[PDB]
Write a structure and sequence with these properties.
This is part of a larger assembly, with one copy of chain A (22 residues), one copy of chain B (122 residues), two copies of chain C and three copies of chain D. With 22 residues, chain A is mostly loops. Chain A has no helix or strand. The N and C termini of chain A lie far apart (36 Å). Chain B is globular and about 45 Å long. The chains are: A little secondary structure (22), B mainly alpha (122), C mainly alpha (50), D alpha+beta (374). At the D-F interface, strand 5 and helix 6 of D face helix 4 and strand 13 of F. Strand 5 of chain D pairs antiparallel with strand 13 of chain F, so a sheet runs across the interface. The site of one adenosine-5'-diphosphate has 17 residues of chain F, from helix 6. One adenosine-5'-diphosphate (ADP) binds next to helix 6 of chain G. Chain B: This is Spectrin beta chain. Chain B: Composed of nonhomologous chains, alpha and beta, which aggregate to form dimers, tetramers, and higher polymers. Interacts with BCAM.
Chain lengths: 22, 122, 50, 374, 47, 374, 373
């Protein structure tokens, strides 16, 4: 599955609810 | 199930797990073909514990102690522990394996038990 | 109350019992509709925020 | 089939992750805990279970004494290590360990007997045909996708930094601060005593850890946040205990991870993580500092506190000369970065030579890893 | 085989049906509360 | 040897229940009362016999003084226990105890000499080949069919609460409270005095106990029921004495079991049963409490009063946090549950390893019961 | 000369009070508040609602007895106000408006507790100055040495702190909630085994007296169990207040053994020797050698005969062989927490330490964190 994806940096396993503060 | 595809981790694990359950069901049905038994569902049928004892009797080649007669949860735990004790006495290394794990019906533990009995009785 | 009938009181209790059963049925359908709506709204919000 | 997929197993102090080579995600993730019953059984005929490994121990927390086999990145107890490794291979994965190669990760600076013992266990007990051992923060660069940058990996055990310039790693610039997440858990336990909530047992440390993971964040400005917390009660949260009690975390939310940047709270005189990163930068040469400032990479679960990237950027910008720009690269999947890059290490065609063969171990003992790995 | 035994059976069946109905209803209510609890934060994050 | 079936004997404070293993109901149920001649004159009905045991003593109340061999779960008179056991083995089950194993019950917190004397008396005066001593509240959970919950037992001599999680009992959370049916009977005599009726002797005690077993109920709200009873005579019921006159208890039918919820009526400063169960739950760990709230199990003959389940649920729901879910499991056959689980326990195949052999007793004395039993 | 300050030690079991500069407290009484249980039929008697101190202990039969302090935390504050009023006006006959007050606190506890004491003593008693000090620091003052590790154990809290050359290490402070009241409850639960029954709050005082008179720490536990099982030479006889005679026997040394093995109470914590060794091991490498030879015991709970030998043996077993272990157990250690306090208020520089009335008026009740350690 790595061999198909160009960038593992921009990768999502879950929404993660980032950036909730403020 | 939305929560199933919520995370990329467990969806992939169960994608493997479904196929493994099918393969294990075919493998156990062949050895239970001689005795008048059939595994319709791997999780539900092994909860009683008698059928796993019949599998051990077919696979080992020697008789097992007969199950106790009952309908409650304690009897099912007793039947599962009899087979687990027989497997322990056969010097088959089983760890993190308990009777209440089988009775509660944990997917990974049942699959690991079937995989171990496949590998060690081959 | 000095004057009362056992039959009448039993009969009123049967009335209240069927009212309870009916109430719990609207409760169940009520909540099933609610949970389905909330699940769909959450899924749509998650997709568009992703 | 010819070549078969080699499985990778990332072992840390907090969680153990495992999965195949080509997969984008690990097969299975579970805590590295071994549990044993403290009380005595009273009913005849439930079934025997001497030890509880993994999530079964996490389910029955309030009846066992939880134990961690890894302390500060060093395997203290080995029989537990065969317990977790057997549970990984034969239960979570359902694969035969003798028909695959195994990749393992470890900290940069650690006793050599650790490496020798993992090699001997993987060869003598599990009959693995080949194995390899790699540094975690090296694999973070493979996961990031760049061949030039500095990695700061902060796990549950250790916090180590390493710079790599164009595929060449400088060993004299590697620093290993011993601050980690378990120390922050202990500090959170110590500061919740102020409000009156007491958490003592080993089964309750997991509750404290969950509170830490849910209601903690890194303040951008510490003293101003102290003033705001002393002014009003806007930044207060409520947590729900498993038995129904409700606690009010209040001020402490940004006082737990602030110990990362000021270790004098915990009594240590060592520098913070930002000063450790800066000192690891200045231990390198003049011509490569410009590239290293632009490729700082965060890794490890401990760096998942909200607002940690901005705080690190501000502190390093204050320390560094003003003429350069500093960007902190924090991917949203850093928790598995140590795994993910490791998977990339098992898919390369040139990596097939680097495996430690069974014959080499048979002819050279377990000390072959000091020559073959790193 | 008479009407009074049928009356007793009918009211007993109705009673146990009602009890199962509130059990299912209250469990569903707590699940509903949890789902709404999760969804509202997602909307705020979208904003 | 499957023909050899063990005997299940429960020695309660009020009644003794004996039967064969593997049966749904006990074969013999009879009160444990020893009747001895009065001093006013010679008796009419017996000659060479010194005393009457069982229902024969209960029928001839007018010429006998009645004594209970069990006082608060403690065997004060051991010869009386030998008489009771001899009557049980020879006159009710009609079997020789030499050929059958015996299973017995015990309260949790007892003098340690109770088990030793019981084992010695059984082995020496009955020559049983095997025996075992078990604890009542574990047998109640066996009868209920689950392996997790709190058991609140209330017999004729003692009340005790014990928690069990997955078959591990917590000995530090076991509570024992001295409140049973005998104190309720004495309070019923004291509150039947002001209506005019007077009860003094032991036959009067049996009459009052018979009144209590058939006329008393637990009020849901004490003040509201008190106002209702003062308002009209709806709650009044009539009883027929053996002499012929008819009494009318009226108000105090729900005042007798209220001592179980307010012990200050009896003058003791202990807490009620609801407070005892809540305190026993709070003594356990934080994690398992959520299970223990969901599986409260009632037992004992004292909990046979109608309305006890809803009242106990209301009280615990008042005490417990609002988030938690509480249900009370009151089986309709609970009066014999302590026996029923025993019939389960002698049927299990593992339990055959747990018997105490005659030979093991012969080498180890009566102290083998502490090592072999819990 | 200036007015001597009042040294008041609030323990979990007993309250002590006296004047600064004295070598002994002037008033010692149990910290118990009792209330009537039954009904009064005699008209014209006393109509007092609450018995406090020794008067509550004088009449135990008709009272329910309560402790305002449990586990080093104040749970009821009206009872604390009654305790302090009886201490000031009756036991000492002093005017609190003209005396500075020193108070005593466990190391780790809820924070708000401190504020409440300050908020009481400036408001209801109108003291001109007050201060709060940790128990073990005062114990080290009364030991007479600047460098050492202090282990203190009362009825509510056990705590170990290390101090090197007057510098404390806050991260090495250890607290344990196993204390005297837990030993009393365990003695009740183990005396149930012999058939003796004690249930009420009045009988807990009887059990506490039995524990104080007839308990000792065995040097070796399994050997003592074998000796007590083999012969009956270890038994002792006690006389109840109603003339009954009971025999303790094997329960004499099993109750204090729970201090070293907390698994007897179901606690998974470590023993007191393990706590002391862990508190030593958390310190720096250099200062350990001085800490091994300067271990100080304190508090009433450490008055079991034979505690010092057992503690020294266990610590010597844990410690490396080349270091030597000295356990310092002064014979008057029960009052050490008071005595050092009486020292501390007599120093010259401590007149610069007081929290004045004006400072509290200026900065509210939260001033106590800035001044007191
Ligand atoms: N969501 C989160 N927010 C903050 N901290 C977290 C979060 N999840 C995990 N942690 C911390 O990170 C640790 C796990 O880190 P991990 O990367 O699993 O370490 P390792 O893999 O080296 O064992 C946990 O002990 C916890 O303290
Ligand atoms: N139908 C009933 N209603 C109310 N109370 C009853 C009833 N039957 C028995 N009891 C009470 O239960 C007591 C007997 O309890 P029992 O089951 O013998 O206790 P044990 O656990 O000691 O065997 C009697 O003294 C009586 O007070
Ligand atoms: N002579 C003694 N022998 C053994 N234990 C004692 C003795 N005297 C007191 N104790 C124990 O010490 C406790 C009193 O400790 P105390 O110094 O009053 O604690 P604090 O004052 O810190 O609350 C009592 O509960 C008792 O259990």
């Amino acid at each position: 599955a790595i061999l198909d994806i160009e960038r593992p940096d921009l990768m999502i396993y879950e929404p993660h609810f980032t950036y909730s503060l403020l | 199930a939305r929560l199933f595809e919520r995370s990329r981790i467990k969806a992939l694990a169960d994608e493997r797990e479904v196929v493994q359950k099918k393969t294990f069901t075919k493998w156990v049905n062949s050895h239970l073909a001689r005795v008048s038994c059939r595994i319709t569902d791997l999780y539900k049928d092994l909860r009683d514990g008698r059928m796993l004892i019949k599998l051990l009797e077919v696979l080992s080649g020697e008789m097992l102690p007969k199950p106790t007669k009952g309908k409650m949860r304690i009897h099912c735990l007793e039947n599962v522990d009899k087979a687990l004790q027989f497997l322990k006495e056969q010097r088959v290394h089983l760890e993190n394996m308990g009777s209440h794990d089988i009775v509660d019906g944990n997917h990974r533990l049942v699959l690991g038990l079937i995989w171990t009995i496949i590998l060690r009785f081959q | 109350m000095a004057g009362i009938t056992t039959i009448e009181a039993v009969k009123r209790k049967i009335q209240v019992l069927q009212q309870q059963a009916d109430d719990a049925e609207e409760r169940a359908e009520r909540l099933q509709r609610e949970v389905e709506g909330e699940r769909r709204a959450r899924e749509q919000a998650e997709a568009e925020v992703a | 089939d010819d070549d078969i997929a080699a499985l990778v197993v990332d072992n840390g102090s907090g969680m153990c992750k495992a999965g195949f080579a080509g997969d984008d995600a690990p097969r299975a993730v579970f805590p590295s805990i071994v549990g044993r019953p403290r009380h005595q059984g009273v009913m005849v005929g439930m079934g025997q279970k001497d030890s509880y490994v993994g999530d079964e121990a996490q389910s029955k927390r309030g009846i066992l004494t939880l134990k961690y086999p890894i302390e500060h990145g060093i395997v203290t107890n080995w029989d537990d290590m065969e317990k977790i490794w057997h549970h990984t291979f034969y239960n979570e994965l359902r694969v035969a360990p003798e028909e695959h190669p195994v990749l393992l990760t470890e900290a940069p600076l650690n006793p050599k007997a650790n490496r020798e013992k993992m090699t001997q266990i993987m060869f003598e007990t599990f009959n693995t045909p080949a194995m390899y051992v790699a540094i975690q923060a090296v694999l973070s660069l493979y996961a990031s996708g760049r061949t030039t940058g500095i990695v700061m990996d902060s796990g549950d055990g250790v916090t180590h930094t390493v710079p790599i310039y164009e595929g060449y790693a400088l060993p004299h610039a590697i620093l290993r601060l011993d601050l980690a997440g378990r120390d922050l858990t202990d500090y959170l336990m110590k500061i919740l005593t102020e409000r009156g909530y007491s958490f003592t047992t080993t089964a309750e440390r997991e509750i404290v850890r969950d509170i830490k993971e849910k209601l903690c964040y890194v303040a951008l400005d510490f003293e101003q946040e102290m003033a705001t917390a002393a002014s009003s009660s806007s930044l207060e949260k409520s947590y729900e205990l498993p038995d129904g009690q409700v606690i009010t975390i209040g001020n402490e939310r940004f006082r737990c991870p602030e110990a990362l940047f000021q270790p004098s709270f915990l009594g240590m005189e060592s520098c913070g993580i930002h000063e450790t990163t800066f000192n690891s930068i200045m231990k390198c040469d003049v011509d490569i500092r410009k590239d290293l400032y632009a490729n700082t990479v965060l890794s490890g679960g401990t760096t998942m506190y909200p607002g940690i990237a901005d705080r690190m950027q501000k502190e390093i910008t204050a320390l560094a000369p003003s003429t350069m720009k500093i960007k902190i690269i924090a991917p949203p999947e850093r928790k598995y970065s140590v795994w993910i890059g490791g998977s990339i290490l098992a898919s390369l065609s040139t990596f097939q030579q680097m495996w430690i063969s069974k014959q080499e171990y048979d002819e050279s003992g377990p000390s072959i890893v000091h020559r073959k790995c790193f």
